[PDB]
Amino acid sequence: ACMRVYITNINGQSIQSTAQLCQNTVTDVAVSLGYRELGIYCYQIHTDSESELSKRLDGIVAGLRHGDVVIFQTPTWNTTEFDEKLMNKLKLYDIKIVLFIHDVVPLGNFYLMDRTIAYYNKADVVVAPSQKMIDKLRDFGMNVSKTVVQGMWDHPTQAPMFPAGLKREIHFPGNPERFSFVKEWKYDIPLKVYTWQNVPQNVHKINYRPDEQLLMEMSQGGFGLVWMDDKDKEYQSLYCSYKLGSFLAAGIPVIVQEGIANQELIENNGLGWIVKDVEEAIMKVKNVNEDEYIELVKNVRSFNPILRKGFFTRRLLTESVFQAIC
Amino acid sequence: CMRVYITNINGQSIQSTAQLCQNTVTDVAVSLGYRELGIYCYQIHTDSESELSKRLDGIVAGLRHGDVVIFQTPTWNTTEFDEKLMNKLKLYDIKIVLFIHDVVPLMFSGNFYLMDRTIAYYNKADVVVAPSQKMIDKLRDFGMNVSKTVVQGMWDHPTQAPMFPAGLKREIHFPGNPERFSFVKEWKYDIPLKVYTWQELPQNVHKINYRPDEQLLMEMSQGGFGLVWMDDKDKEYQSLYCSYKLGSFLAAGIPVIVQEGIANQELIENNGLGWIVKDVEEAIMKVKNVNEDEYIELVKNVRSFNPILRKGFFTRRLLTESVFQAICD
Amino acid sequence: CMRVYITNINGQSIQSTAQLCQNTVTDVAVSLGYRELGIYCYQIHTDSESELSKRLDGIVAGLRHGDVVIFQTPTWNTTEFDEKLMNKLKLYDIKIVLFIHDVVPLSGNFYLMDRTIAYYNKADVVVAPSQKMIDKLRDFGMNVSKTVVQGMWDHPTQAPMFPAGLKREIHFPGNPERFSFVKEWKYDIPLKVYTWQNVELPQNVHKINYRPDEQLLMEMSQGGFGLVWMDDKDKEYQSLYCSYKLGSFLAAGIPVIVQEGIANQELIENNGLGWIVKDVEEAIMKVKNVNEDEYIELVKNVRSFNPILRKGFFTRRLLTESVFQAIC
Amino acid sequence: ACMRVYITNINGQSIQSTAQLCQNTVTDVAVSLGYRELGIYCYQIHTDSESELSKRLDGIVAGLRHGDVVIFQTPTWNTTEFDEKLMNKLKLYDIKIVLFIHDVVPLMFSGNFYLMDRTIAYYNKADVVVAPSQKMIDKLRDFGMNVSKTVVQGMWDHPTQAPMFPAGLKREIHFPGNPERFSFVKEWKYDIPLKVYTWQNVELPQNVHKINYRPDEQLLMEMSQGGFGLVWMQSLYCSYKLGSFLAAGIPVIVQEGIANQELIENNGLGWIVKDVEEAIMKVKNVNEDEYIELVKNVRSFNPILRKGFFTRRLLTESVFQAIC
Numbered sequence A: 001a002c003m004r005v006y007i008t009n010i011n012g013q014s015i016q017s018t019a020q021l022c023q024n025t026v027t028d029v030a031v032s033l034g035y036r037e038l039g040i041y042c043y044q045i046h047t048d049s050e051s052e053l054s055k056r057l058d059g060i061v062a063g064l065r066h067g068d069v070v071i072f073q074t075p076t077w078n079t080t081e082f083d084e085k086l087m088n089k090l091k092l093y094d095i096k097i098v099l100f101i102h103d104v105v106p107l108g109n110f111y112l113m114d115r116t117i118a119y120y121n122k123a124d125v126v127v128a129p130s131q132k133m134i135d136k137l138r139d140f141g142m143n144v145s146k147t148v149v150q151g152m153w154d155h156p157t158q159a160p161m162f163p164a165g166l167k168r169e170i171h172f173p174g175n176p177e178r179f180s181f182v183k184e185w186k187y188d189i190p191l192k193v194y195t196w197q198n199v200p201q202n203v204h205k206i207n208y209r210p211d212e213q214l215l216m217e218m219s220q221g222g223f224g225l226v227w228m229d230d231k232d233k234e235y236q237s238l239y240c241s242y243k244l245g246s247f248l249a250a251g252i253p254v255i256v257q258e259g260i261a262n263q264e265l266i267e268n269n270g271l272g273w274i275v276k277d278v279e280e281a282i283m284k285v286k287n288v289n290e291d292e293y294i295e296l297v298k299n300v301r302s303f304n305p306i307l308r309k310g311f312f313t314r315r316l317l318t319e320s321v322f323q324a325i326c
Numbered sequence B: 001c002m003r004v005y006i007t008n009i010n011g012q013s014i015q016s017t018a019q020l021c022q023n024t025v026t027d028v029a030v031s032l033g034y035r036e037l038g039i040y041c042y043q044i045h046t047d048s049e050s051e052l053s054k055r056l057d058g059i060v061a062g063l064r065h066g067d068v069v070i071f072q073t074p075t076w077n078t079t080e081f082d083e084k085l086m087n088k089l090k091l092y093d094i095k096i097v098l099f100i101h102d103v104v105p106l107m108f109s110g111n112f113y114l115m116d117r118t119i120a121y122y123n124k125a126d127v128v129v130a131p132s133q134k135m136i137d138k139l140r141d142f143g144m145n146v147s148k149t150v151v152q153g154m155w156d157h158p159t160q161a162p163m164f165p166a167g168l169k170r171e172i173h174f175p176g177n178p179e180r181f182s183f184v185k186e187w188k189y190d191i192p193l194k195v196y197t198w199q200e201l202p203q204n205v206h207k208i209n210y211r212p213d214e215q216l217l218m219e220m221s222q223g224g225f226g227l228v229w230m231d232d233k234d235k236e237y238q239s240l241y242c243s244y245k246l247g248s249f250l251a252a253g254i255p256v257i258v259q260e261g262i263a264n265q266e267l268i269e270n271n272g273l274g275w276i277v278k279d280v281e282e283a284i285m286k287v288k289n290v291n292e293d294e295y296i297e298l299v300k301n302v303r304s305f306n307p308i309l310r311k312g313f314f315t316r317r318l319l320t321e322s323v324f325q326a327i328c329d
Numbered sequence C: 001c002m003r004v005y006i007t008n009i010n011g012q013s014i015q016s017t018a019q020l021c022q023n024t025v026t027d028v029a030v031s032l033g034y035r036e037l038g039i040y041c042y043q044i045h046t047d048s049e050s051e052l053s054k055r056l057d058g059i060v061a062g063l064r065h066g067d068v069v070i071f072q073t074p075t076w077n078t079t080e081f082d083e084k085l086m087n088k089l090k091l092y093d094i095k096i097v098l099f100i101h102d103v104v105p106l107s108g109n110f111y112l113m114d115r116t117i118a119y120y121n122k123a124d125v126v127v128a129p130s131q132k133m134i135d136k137l138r139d140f141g142m143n144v145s146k147t148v149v150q151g152m153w154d155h156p157t158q159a160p161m162f163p164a165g166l167k168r169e170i171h172f173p174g175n176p177e178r179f180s181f182v183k184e185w186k187y188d189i190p191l192k193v194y195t196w197q198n199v200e201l202p203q204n205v206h207k208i209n210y211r212p213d214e215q216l217l218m219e220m221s222q223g224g225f226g227l228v229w230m231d232d233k234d235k236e237y238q239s240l241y242c243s244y245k246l247g248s249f250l251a252a253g254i255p256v257i258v259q260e261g262i263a264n265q266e267l268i269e270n271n272g273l274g275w276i277v278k279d280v281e282e283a284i285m286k287v288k289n290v291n292e293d294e295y296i297e298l299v300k301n302v303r304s305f306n307p308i309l310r311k312g313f314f315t316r317r318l319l320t321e322s323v324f325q326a327i328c
Numbered sequence D: 001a002c003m004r005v006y007i008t009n010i011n012g013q014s015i016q017s018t019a020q021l022c023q024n025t026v027t028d029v030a031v032s033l034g035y036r037e038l039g040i041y042c043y044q045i046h047t048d049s050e051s052e053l054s055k056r057l058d059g060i061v062a063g064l065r066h067g068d069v070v071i072f073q074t075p076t077w078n079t080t081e082f083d084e085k086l087m088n089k090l091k092l093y094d095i096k097i098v099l100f101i102h103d104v105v106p107l108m109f110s111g112n113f114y115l116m117d118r119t120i121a122y123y124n125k126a127d128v129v130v131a132p133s134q135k136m137i138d139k140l141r142d143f144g145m146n147v148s149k150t151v152v153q154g155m156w157d158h159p160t161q162a163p164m165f166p167a168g169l170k171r172e173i174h175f176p177g178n179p180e181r182f183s184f185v186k187e188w189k190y191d192i193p194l195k196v197y198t199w200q201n202v203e204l205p206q207n208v209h210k211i212n213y214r215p216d217e218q219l220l221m222e223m224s225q226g227g228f229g230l231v232w233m234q235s236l237y238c239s240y241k242l243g244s245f246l247a248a249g250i251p252v253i254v255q256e257g258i259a260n261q262e263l264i265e266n267n268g269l270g271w272i273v274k275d276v277e278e279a280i281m282k283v284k285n286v287n288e289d290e291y292i293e294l295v296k297n298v299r300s301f302n303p304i305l306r307k308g309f310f311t312r313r314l315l316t317e318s319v320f321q322a323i324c
């Protein structure tokens, strides 16, 4: 009996899926720690007889041995049915299971919240974006005793950082479809939106670029905006933003919405400003002098080796396996 | 973004050497930052064509175009399974390293019909790692035309078992099964023979029960000689394969006795790791005649050579060189 | 481009547990991609001041601004060396993790506390064996704000674990010159002492010759109980540290018996790894009574818990968390 | 007797030093393989007394033990005296020594030939020699180098994850080296533009675009947009520039003779040309499809350079050969 740690990893999604991006990046760190990938392909679950699905899963977990530990990165995006039966398959082994939450599907839409929580409760440790997320999940019946807070996505990279000049512009590499505040841009601060989609005056569309390029370009100065839409104001209070990690790894300060999860990280480390609303953000971008920009930048760049070396991830990947056995 | 993947069987008996080698190789591959494609040993005919195909899709779900895959063959799931795994792999734009642990039609007179199908699927790899040059030669004669070949040379035996000081015990160690090795029963000499096995034999042969490898290593290190031998039934294969027993003796820290004609025998010759003997009589005779002086030297050569074995360097180099060859012309 | 380095001592006797520890932490560290800053144990007074300085420049030659350095203390080259290594480290723009294996000023050695504390305080993060250790260190002026608790030693190993039978015997792989209760051993339960010392022992102590750790693990895994016991003058200083042999028993796969108030005692209780006893006499009683099933369970707890020990997870978490903390 | 592998690595040179860049790249690969760094700092050896030197060295190798293997990246650039002395220290341990040659000082010009005997003497204490090219090994043998086990490096790697942009057929030649070292640049006289990436002040001939020095990753991204990489100058060693071009994902043009050119030919990675004028011709005549093919070749071969495989093999093979 010789313990190995395995971790699930999705494959086959779009060139531009942040979801897969997250998992693959977590997995690369995990591989570097000695862990083993359980590759999972993103496909149409209805395409399998319930029996072919049982055996595709046997294919996926073929290397598993009792005494192992499995880190399940949820969701698989293969349907709650897949999630459920993957879990069920793992519960047949005499192993500890770490549930690593990237998103809670119902949070839209809301109905399957119950079957979601239900297989969640089968894990031994839960890793979640924030304590607020854990608290809110307990409210729906989540009863796993050992929980670990993720805090922040890393963003492992060796993209050169150029000196950050005080450009009074704002960067935002999300998609307008999901963020409608972007179409409502009123202010005379340029908003640089990085997206594939083609949809005001001061918003400037920029072509989707490989992540390393975006980082290099963003490092030349400016501010990074982390901002949700108005129903997404639920999550935001709960999830970890991926682009937040991308701003910080690039070496520029951030502007986040008052009430975002884990805001303490931003404050304690002097990484940017927590503002009430867009207006206040604009104001600060207009007010900030050369001095206080130079400070925020140096704060970001003394902080970001954590992000670029993948330590929030190495941290939770190590602690959760230990808590599972301990 | 190229990743390197390696297949690894699972599910066989704890006593199975085939799985033991594959796991060990995998353990070394993982340390090199490679990725496991786990494969479970089961009865292939409990699947419909659709199900087997989808079990394979599950096994290879993480592969992408541009990756490299090392197929550790055989899977012991049948030539049929090997062939369809290979077929799946060829749908990807990847390079395939075929790493041969055994050639199943060459190792049993009755498995020979499978030669042609085995070769056909061998010829789909970009690189073949074979135990010996002689095995590659033999493969060629049966139609194997894979242009790039790497010689494995020897099985490592990664470990940290204590090595005790080796005294000149005039005994011979043999951790194999009497079934696969019938000569055991016809043991007739007055030099003791220790047979380590889970399984009925002559007076000068002592049966010791199957221990976990680590303990076997510690015990063997106390001295004596490791015998690497095969019956005349397998004299053919012997000139071709790599013995795992060989690597276990040397890792333990004792000299070995091997039959003339065995694969990669110059390895033993040039590193002074034991004796190449014509027959069992010549070995028994050398064990009775060797003096303290000579045994001292042999043990010295073995324990200066065997860091390679214990740190997995034969495996590290084939794992590194084969992936390199798969890409570079 | 940040690298993590970790100090590691070399040159001590194959018997030195202090080196065995640093070396083990270092091995885990290297598997995590950290880099060794090798330190050799020698007579410091053989060095002129400038020689000592440049020997140190030799040790840290590979360091760069922006690196993170883990200092496993002490080096055993004496405090003067520890202090001079720390100052050398502070000359770089790096974050420093202090990893405490022992604290020298802890009775007549106490006078050294001022110097010891003054260099501890140059660290950004302190990893200490127990919270208790951290508290005592605070009473004497340690003010490093980020601290991590180690909570056990690991024992990474591949040692076969045999099935464990209930044997009413106690294993103690400790030097009997350092533990006196051994010479006083007066009980009908056999005490098995694994030691290099060529001396004879009380009637019911079985002197067993020193053996490679791997062999010791395998042998102990056949059953019996592992005793973690301190002398008497090492009693206060006891409560503080992490027992290395404790880790060895659990990694072998047998339950343990430890004195009341041992550092990180709750780990034993919360995981069902053995018993906390007042004194030897209670320990003898438990071993006399303890039944077959109750033992079976003790073992089950141990072997479900010990893959953490055997794969080095206490160390992996402290090496990972302390670096994170040094930057955060 | 637990064998560990160590590798020397220089530190403390300028950010522009290719020697350091190389030793550091090899070392990072070595660390991923589990090998341990012996960090060496570049200073002025005259500032040490004999005793101080001996103890600085003792500080550098404090972690070695009998039974280890040591890979010595030579030269250290602290001089031959330092290299000889480091080699002397190592020999005092019962270890095997791999000598990995980056440069041979006494072969740099005839003036430095007097150093050959000292150089060869200490080379000969090694158990294995890794050299850039077989040709180099042959030359060394002519001067008394007698280490029986040798390994050929072939090519520098270039570990990176720089995005590769699509390679447009730009009729331009990239050359990230400095002028004060390459005469041919100041003499440029072709209607084909030469993109020279340098930190130097100097203004440059008409059809040269002096581009400011830039981080390696950025350089790689820019070059991946297309055009040709030029390797120009001692066909003894491996060009580091070469690996940068191929990692960036564009084909190369190299001067006839240089070492290991059959790597170029056998993988269809560029052109081996007699002179500069031959290079301008091929850049003028080459058509769209011929160029898509070059790029195909380079981008299929690339992953070796980018994942550090020339280095992984020499680091694995040489340690193996040191014991076997």
Ligand SMILES: O=c1ccn([C@@H]2O[C@H](COP(=O)(O)OP(=O)(O)O)[C@@H](O)[C@H]2O)c(=O)[nH]1
Binding pocket: A018, A173, A174, A175, A194, A195, A207, A208, A209, A210, A211, A214, A240, A241, A242, A243, A244, A246, A247
């Ligand atoms: O041109 C682009 C724009 C987006 N991104 C990536 O997409 C991320 C943001 O995606 P998403 O909005 O889904 O992250 P979220 O903040 O919502 O968690 C950025 O940080 C980048 O990593 C990118 O690689 N190139």
Ligand SMILES: O=c1ccn([C@@H]2O[C@H](COP(=O)(O)OP(=O)(O)O)[C@@H](O)[C@H]2O)c(=O)[nH]1
Binding pocket: B017, B175, B176, B177, B196, B197, B209, B210, B211, B212, B213, B216, B242, B243, B244, B245, B246, B248, B249
């Ligand atoms: O008591 C035993 C006897 C055998 N072995 C293992 O079984 C191997 C021999 O198996 P096999 O005879 O199949 O090796 P090969 O024929 O390839 O030389 C030995 O080297 C050991 O590693 C073991 O672990 N415990």
Ligand SMILES: O=c1ccn([C@@H]2O[C@H](COP(=O)(O)OP(=O)(O)O)[C@@H](O)[C@H]2O)c(=O)[nH]1
Binding pocket: C017, C173, C174, C175, C194, C195, C209, C210, C211, C212, C213, C214, C216, C242, C243, C244, C245, C246, C248, C249
């Ligand atoms: O025959 C022996 C006896 C001791 N030890 C090692 O020495 C440790 C105990 O040493 P020490 O008492 O110094 O550690 P402590 O428990 O006091 O921290 C054991 O756990 C073993 O790992 C060993 O390897 N072989």
Ligand SMILES: O=c1ccn([C@@H]2O[C@H](COP(=O)(O)OP(=O)(O)O)[C@@H](O)[C@H]2O)c(=O)[nH]1
Binding pocket: D018, D176, D177, D178, D197, D198, D212, D213, D214, D215, D216, D217, D219, D238, D239, D240, D241, D242, D244, D245
């Ligand atoms: O703007 C620049 C110019 C050059 N270089 C680096 O310098 C290398 C060339 O160095 P050198 O000419 O010394 O190498 P050589 O080809 O002579 O071996 C390039 O490959 C780059 O990696 C760079 O990073 N940025």
